[PDB]
From a paper:
Besides the generic role of [name] in protein export, [name] homologs are frequently associated (in about 7% of cases) with stress-responsive type II toxin–antitoxin (TA) systems, together forming functional tripartite TA-chaperone (TAC) systems. The human pathogen [name] possesses such a TA-associated [name] chaperone, named Mtb-SecBTA, which specifically controls the Mtb-HigB1 (toxin)-[name] (antitoxin) TA pair. We have recently shown that in contrast with chaperone-independent TA systems, the Mtb-[name] antitoxin of TAC possesses a C-terminal extension, named [name] (chaperone addiction), which makes the antitoxin more aggregation-prone and renders it chaperone-dependent.
To investigate the [name] substrate-binding property, we have solved the structure of Mtb-SecBTA together with the short C-terminal fragment of the Mtb-[name] antitoxin (named [name]), which was found as the main site of interaction with the chaperone, both in vivo and in vitro. The three-dimensional fold of Mtb-SecBTA consists of a six-residue long N-terminal helix (αN) followed by a four-stranded antiparallel β-sheet (β1–β4), each strand contributing 13–16 residues, and a 30-residue long C-terminal helix (α1) that is prolonged by an extended peptide segment running parallel to α1. Two subunits associate through their β1 strands to form β-dimers (A–B and C–D), resulting in an eight-stranded antiparallel β-sheet. Binding occurs on the thinner side of the Mtb-SecBTA chaperone tetramer. On one side, two peptides (chains E and F) are bound in a symmetrical way (related by a twofold axis) and adopt strictly the same extended conformation with a rmsd of 0.6 Å based on main-chain atoms. Each bound peptide makes contact with three protein subunits in a similar way, with some variations. In agreement with previous in vivo data, the structure reveals that three [name] residues play a major structural role in complex formation, namely W108, R110, and Y114.
Residue numbers in the entry:
A (entry chain F), F (entry chain E), G (entry chain G): 104 to 115
B (entry chain C): 13 to 81, 95 to 113, 117 to 166
C (entry chain A): 9 to 42, 45 to 81, 97 to 163
D (entry chain B): 6 to 42, 47 to 80, 97 to 163
E (entry chain D): 10 to 80, 96 to 113, 116 to 162
Write the structure that this text describes.
């Protein structure tokens, strides 16, 4: 696995 | 409260430090499945009142962040210290030190513990965990 | 102290802290820390409540901090809010303006003070001063 | 965008001789105005302090203005500084304004950005807003 | 110079997406005497996680070992940062040489400022004078 | 009109 | 020994 991630945000 | 009132009138806070920390993210969080946490605290006091009129309140913490529905996403073990001294008239006893640590000590340190959890979880790229504001009897 | 404590004491029994937030802050470092240091902290409490419509209230503490060399190095002006819930017994009358203000000056203040301490410590460290640990609230 | 690699050529002489000593917050102001139910805009303004005929050292400052809105909620105005030292060999000339301003816009900016990002994160938390984590600069 | 060249084809097509701390371990073992000079030793090692046949993105990890002493350790820390890069490609996959090359050069360089801010933050919490790591 | 607020959390 | 620690400066 390439240990990627996604960070959650309430912003745009 | 009563057991530590005497030391509470004579003790002054001097400093706060982090003693140690260890943490790791193990897996992705899953808010939508349900994300939760466990936080165990262990208080301690270090004193030697016949030689020095200073003591240290320590709180050891164990944080476990978990996916529900119960898999561990991250874990941390850290410990904060608060340095106090006092001006005496009879030396404080082990009971007096313990009660003071359990009350003023604990509640002085709690905000530092909460800030650290918030900072760490942000750095690990987890949803930021903000601990609850703990109530104290006035 | 004890007379305000008296007046806000029914509130101490019915109320519980829910959350805190920083409402505003302003700070600058003016001159280098040299000798030893000192500080001055003035606070003003306020309370926002509407007991006829909601059984929660907000305590606000405004603060003016000055840090100096013992013979101004830095100043800060900031305001914290703490949100409280209260739960009356059936038939109990609403808190009055005087109970609310008394509580905000005493238990409100006491609840917030350790968070103010952590904020000040963080802010002073960031400004690259010796981190300041506020004295115990007597 | 792409004008940045020219600035790395113009600051390279100084970049080869400069060394970072310290970073600090110089000033901050911030307030929450309205409820979060978000977007943001963040403006930077670099600046350099030097006088390369008295001292062989200079300071890179970056002033930040942050605005948060619902699709204003909160505003912040703060500045960070980094302190650099340099050493000139037997012949060398002093850095000019062009070399100082180019090093500031590149090495200075990239060195400061993590601190700004962390301050933003901490500040939105203390204001009780959704925590804002800025994107990584390329 | 050399690795800059080997990494440049990947460097021209890759963009940084995010940086995070993966793990940390630190302790203050002996309080420093106030204002007596402190020295540091930082050891880093880059590693790269990639599977170009499956995913056109990779993670550069820099692991760090930090020793602080008085001018016998005062404090130590062991921690690892990750940088997530995304790339766009009849061009070939990047080879393990282009990746390792990028990781020890551009990857290290993009991570280093964040390593500096973490060390500063962490030394300050340990009640040490906050350490500002030297320029890379 | 008490200025209350609700902090959002991803945690239960 | 009590594990105290000490700063150069102080605010006392
Ligand atoms: Ca209620
Ligand atoms: Ca110099
Ligand atoms: Ca891709």
């Amino acid at each position: 696995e390439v240990p990627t991630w996604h960070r959650l945000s309430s912003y745009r | 409260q009563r057991v530590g009132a005497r030391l509470a009138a004579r003790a002054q806070i001097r400093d706060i430090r982090l003693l140690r920390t260890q943490a790791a993210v193990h897996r992705a969080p899953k808010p939508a499945q349900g994300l939760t946490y466990d936080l165990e605290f262990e208080p301690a006091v270090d004193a030697d009142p016949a030689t020095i009129s200073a003591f240290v309140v320590r709180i050891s913490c164990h944080l476990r962040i978990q996916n529900q529905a119960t898999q561990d996403v991250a874990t941390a073990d850290f410990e904060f210290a608060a340095l106090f001294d006092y001006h005496l008239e009879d030396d404080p006893t082990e009971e007096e030190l313990t009660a003071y640590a359990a009350t003023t000590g604990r509640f002085a340190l709690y905000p530092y513990i909460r800030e650290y959890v918030y900072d760490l979880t942000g750095r690990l790229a987890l949803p930021p965990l903000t601990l609850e504001i703990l109530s104290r009897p006035m």
